[PDB]
């Protein structure tokens, strides 16, 4: 299983980003003992799905803003506030 790092270009629409995040520093980890920010949901045919985001992706950066060590509220505010277009850097396990 390769750990790959991808850029995902999400265009915000009237339906938001079409994703959910779980985790964050100081919260219950989504995956093992890694309390980072993970994609827990992807809205079918939503902006994130069109851009190629997958559930289980770990969010590393948003438009160059690092959120690897963000707590949950920090990541929410970055994802809400920081652009009509969000270029996410994510890490993903690939077969």
């Amino acid at each position: 299983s390769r750990l790959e790092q991808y850029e995902i270009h999400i265009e915000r629409t009237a339906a938001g980003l079409g994703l959910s995040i779980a985790g964050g520093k100081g919260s219950t980890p989504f995956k093992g003992d890694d309390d980072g920010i993970f994609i827990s949901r992807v809205t079918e045919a939503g902006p994130a799905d069109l851009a190629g985001l997958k559930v289980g992706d770990k969010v590393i950066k948003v438009n160059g803003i690092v959120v690897v060590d963000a707590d949950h509220y920090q990541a929410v505010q970055v994802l809400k506030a920081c652009g009509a277009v969000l270029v996410l850097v994510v890490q993903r396990e690939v077969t």
Binding site: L17, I21, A22, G26, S27, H72, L79
Partner: peptide
Amino acid sequence: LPSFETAL
């Protein structure tokens, strides 16, 4: 610990 999930 909190268990947060936020739809966006």
